[PDB]
Design a binder for these strands. Structure first.
Ligand SMILES: [Mg+2]
Ligand SMILES: [Mg+2]
Ligand SMILES: [Mg+2]
Ligand SMILES: [Mg+2]
Ligand SMILES: [Mg+2]
Ligand SMILES: [Mg+2]
Ligand SMILES: [Mg+2]
Ligand SMILES: [Mg+2]
Ligand SMILES: [Mg+2]
Ligand SMILES: [Mg+2]
Ligand SMILES: [Mg+2]
Ligand SMILES: [Mg+2]
Ligand SMILES: [Mg+2]
Ligand SMILES: [Mg+2]
Ligand SMILES: [Mg+2]
Ligand SMILES: [Mg+2]
Ligand SMILES: [Mg+2]
Ligand SMILES: [Mg+2]
Ligand SMILES: [Mg+2]
Ligand SMILES: [Mg+2]
Lengths: 210, 147, 203, 46, 102, 52
RNA sequence: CAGUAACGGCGAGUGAACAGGGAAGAGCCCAGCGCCGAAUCCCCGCCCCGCGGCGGGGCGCGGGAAAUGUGGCGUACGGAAG
RNA sequence: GGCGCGCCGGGCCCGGGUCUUCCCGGAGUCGGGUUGCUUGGGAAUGCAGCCCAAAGCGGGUGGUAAACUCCAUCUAAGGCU
């Protein structure tokens, strides 16, 4: 029974919703539960990073988001085999791996390759038994100053290049951008139909010439 | 607060603010906004014209990411880049022009709403409107594309 | 190996070799009773690729589900209700007859656990399924690490929670855009996340 | 028990050739046929 | 002129140096190995054909190919599968014609 | 019911406005005696001590 | 994301998903293809040890299971052999 | 109880890179038709009954049915966590 003027609306309460209402009164108890669990995990893996492994440079999928770079799932096998880290040794020394990632580009692969080689220059790997080091172990001086780092290991930020104040060329001042966009729109929409009309013109051409 | 509300001053009034001829019955006009076509016709036509019926094509799987192209204007095109570039490109007698990369600021399409100050630029967008391009050319300065 | 040959043989079913075989098998199974122990699988390759490693502790049953749809178990006509819910004759049941087969075999053997199940034969009025059972208290099973998972209490009666292949195919799950109405644990977990108010503290 | 006598003989010999055999089982038999190392194949009828 | 990388058009997109990697080893599933080809035509020489296949081979022998194709697509399903099975039965029937020739 | 809206939120800048007004009203000697704290013999009102 | 795309005597009403930010984060294994003298497993008896989660070792011309296929390598990120 | 140390016995005598030669897959299941239920899923999203019922440069997905044709992306019909 609506009155004079006001938005007509459809509240989704026609079901019996009072038997199922999730109330958030354990929000701070759940946060202190999670951070006590996080402190226990971070002190039970004692020199290792609390954030877990390292996760690669990854560009977001869709048109809204492809200019932003975020942390991905794991390093792909192709940048692992370029960085020389073995498939089953990467996650055991702390490098996350998913095999499902492709690498369709080259420069993102080389960014992940340089990021892995930076990680291997940065990590301090302890000998397995302390009384007997091996060839792939760090030196006992930097073993003394090893410690955890908080937050995500080598944080991933989308740094932007900065291009200086150019003096403008007259080719750029005679570039007609709106006509170029609409002309490319029209060519892309009409690519196929012009091709089949060229095909029909070719077949009537060979009919008129043969 | 219930201390400030109405029902603290409707005690002792034998109908509690809902009349005595027409009592406060439960649901007299149907539940919700029922009776659109039938008996609330003139509310829905004096106050929500357009409400009944279909118009336009059905699009089964819409993705706002595909339809994403947010706009900026030539008024606020200089807002994106700090004041030091403006005052340096005003003091700068060499004709060098700053680059305004609108995409990293987060706007894909430059539309041209208002007056742009007479100061050269390289506006670097993903789309352009015709009037925005003509105003940047009329200031003297170029419109480059990035995808 | 032979199992590639006999699996191509079982894929050729309208070939008259296999038509004679499954017709005589279906006759024999129709004569024999509803729930009897098969001593060894009729289809060893499919038994092995479903999990039957022929050692001590795996048994195989051969059970007969009665073929057909499901008419609504209601007195004579008379579903007392609105005319959407009148029809009783052409209703169909949500689980496959393979799942019903492994269900009643795993019910008849309460001590044993359904691994998987497969097909052997059919006629117009019955279908026949051989279901693989594992004895979880036998020590050739219990001392083998890659199959002592069946000996845990969470895997109690897989066939009735619907966790095998035949029960799994009737819950409507799997990755994709085809299975939006089950994300969460299951179909009801999907429904239950969707139809609750998350009334926060601060709203 | 013949293999146990053979292996104890070999173990005491090392602490001090392969004869040809039948090859049973339908998988070994059919891979020997399709790799063509069989000289004849006996097949049970039942 | 100037060909800036445009967001629209037939050659749209941010230009990138496409690497050439080997295809992943999941992509070759169903690429017919010659051993499985041998197993499969051995099994077909054991067991023969289906009844709908025999009637389809007979319609290809009489050569009414349109009703043959409609027959396979009604008794198998998709028209792509029907084209494939008609072409395979024509190949089998051609092998029978060559064997019956000599 | 339990799902009464118990908890209320207020904006960060006016939370900080209120914390600044509470500090700045603890520096006028009238508004401290007005709250009632007997400070008639305190040597100076924004009363600071050694960090010892 | 969204009370959106969408369903609905298109009426009342119903109504997801992707992408993004977070919590957490861990991956793996068979059958098949194969190659290794079934290289595998269960149970009884005796001796030693421990035994309130009946296990470790040896001895058995001890019994079974298993070639209608157990174990070792090996699984789509390929893998094996030389 | 766990994290620590040492002794006895047992088990395993293991890896990586390059070249060459081989090998590779789950069927009354997929899919199609029809019926019924369900889903926001709309020329049928999922589920099931009946019938038809495959293939291997194959098969599925690619939110309008269908044919031709490029592509894209995965590998179902087995299992643990
Ligand atoms: Mg009123
Ligand atoms: Mg009054
Ligand atoms: Mg009254
Ligand atoms: Mg009234
Ligand atoms: Mg009246
Ligand atoms: Mg009322
Ligand atoms: Mg009327
Ligand atoms: Mg009704
Ligand atoms: Mg599970
Ligand atoms: Mg199905
Ligand atoms: Mg909104
Ligand atoms: Mg109407
Ligand atoms: Mg997401
Ligand atoms: Mg985190
Ligand atoms: Mg084996
Ligand atoms: Mg139902
Ligand atoms: Mg409905
Ligand atoms: Mg197409
Ligand atoms: Mg699998
Ligand atoms: Mg799987």
């Amino acid at each position: 029974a609506p009155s004079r003027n006001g938005m007509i609306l459809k509240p989704h309460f026609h079901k019996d919703w009072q038997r199922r209402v999730a109330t958030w009164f354990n929000q701070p108890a759940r946060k202190i539960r999670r951070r006590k669990a996080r402190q226990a995990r971070a002190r039970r893996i004692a020199p290792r990073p609390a954030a877990g492994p390292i996760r690669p440079i990854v560009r977001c999928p869709t048109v809204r988001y492809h200019t932003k770079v975020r942390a991905g799932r794991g390093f792909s096998l192709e940048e692992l085999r370029v960085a020389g880290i073995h498939k089953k040794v990467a996650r055991t020394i702390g490098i996350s791996v998913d095999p499902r990632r492709r690498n369709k580009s080259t420069e993102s692969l080389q960014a992940n390759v340089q990021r892995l080689k930076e990680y291997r220059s940065k990590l301090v790997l302890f000998p397995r038994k302390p009384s007997a080091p091996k060839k792939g172990d760090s030196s006992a001086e930097e073993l003394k100053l090893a410690t955890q780092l908080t937050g995500p290991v080598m944080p991933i930020r989308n740094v932007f290049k900065k291009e200086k104040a150019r003096v403008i060329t007259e080719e750029e001042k005679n570039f007609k951008a709106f006509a170029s966009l609409r002309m490319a729109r029209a060519n892309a929409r009409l690519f196929g139909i012009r091709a089949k009309r060229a095909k029909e013109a070719a077949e009537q051409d060979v009919e008129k010439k043969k | 607060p219930s201390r400030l509300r109405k029902t603290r001053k409707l005690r002792g009034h034998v109908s509690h603010g809902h009349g005595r001829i027409g009592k406060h019955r439960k649901h007299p006009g149907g539940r919700g906004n029922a009776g659109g076509m039938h008996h609330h016709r003139i509310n829905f036509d004096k106050y929500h014209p357009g409400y009944f019926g279909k118009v336009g094509m059905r699009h089964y799987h819409l993705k706002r990411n595909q339809s994403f192209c947010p706009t900026v204007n030539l008024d606020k095109l200089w807002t994106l880049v700090s004041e030091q570039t403006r005052v340096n490109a005003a003091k700068n007698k060499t004709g060098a022009a700053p680059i305004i990369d609108v995409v990293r600021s987060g706007y894909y399409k430059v539309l041209g709403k208002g007056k742009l100050p007479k100061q050269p630029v390289i506006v670097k967008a993903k789309f352009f409107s015709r009037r925005a391009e003509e105003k940047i050319k009329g200031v003297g300065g170029a419109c480059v594309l990035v995808a | 190996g032979a199992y590639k040959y006999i699996q191509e043989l079982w894929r050729k079913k309208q070939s008259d070799v296999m038509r004679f075989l499954l017709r005589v098998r279906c006759w024999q199974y129709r004569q024999l009773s509803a729930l009897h122990r098969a001593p060894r699988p009729t289809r060893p390759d499919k038994a092995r690729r479903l999990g039957y490693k022929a050692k001590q502790g795996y048994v195989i049953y051969r059970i007969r589900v009665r073929r057909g749809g499901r008419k609504r178990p209601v007195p004579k006509g008379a579903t007392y209700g609105k005319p959407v819910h009148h029809g009783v004759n052409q209703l169909k049941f949500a689980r496959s007859l393979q799942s019903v087969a492994e269900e009643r075999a795993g019910r008849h053997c309460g001590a044993l656990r359904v691994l998987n199940s497969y097909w052997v034969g059919e006629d117009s009025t019955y279908k026949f399924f051989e279901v693989i059972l594992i004895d979880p208290f036998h020590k050739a099973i219990r001392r083998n690490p890659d199959t002592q998972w069946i000996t845990k209490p969470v895997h109690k009666h897989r066939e009735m929670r619907g966790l095998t292949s035949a029960g799994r195919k009737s819950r409507g799950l799997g990755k994709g855009h085809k299975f939006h109405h089950t994300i969460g644990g299951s179909r009801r977990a999907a429904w239950r996340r969707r139809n609750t108010l998350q009334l926060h503290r601060y709203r | 028990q013949e293999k146990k006598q053979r292996l104890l003989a070999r173990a005491e010999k090392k602490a001090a050739k392969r004869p040809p055999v039948l090859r049973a089982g339908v998988n070994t038999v059919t891979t020997l046929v399709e790799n063509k190392k069989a000289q004849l194949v006996v097949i049970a009828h039942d | 002129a100037l060909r800036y990388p445009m967001a629209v058009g037939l050659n749209k997109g941010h230009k990138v140096t496409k690497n050439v990697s080997k295809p992943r080893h999941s992509r070759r599933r169903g690429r017919l190995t010659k051993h499985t080809k041998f197993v499969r035509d051995m099994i077909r020489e054991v067991c023969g054909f289906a009844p709908y296949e025999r009637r389809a081979m007979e319609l290809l022998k009489v050569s009414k190919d349109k009703r043959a194709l409609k027959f396979i697509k009604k008794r198998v399903g998709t028209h792509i599968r029907a084209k494939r099975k008609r072409e395979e039965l024509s190949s089998v029937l051609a092998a029978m014609r060559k064997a019956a020739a000599k | 019911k339990t799902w009464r809206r118990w908890h209320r939120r207020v904006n960060t800048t006016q939370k900080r406005y209120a914390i600044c007004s509470a500090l700045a009203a603890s520096a006028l000697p009238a508004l401290v005696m007005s709250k009632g704290h007997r400070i008639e013999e305190v040597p100076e009102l924004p009363l600071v001590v050694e960090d010892k």
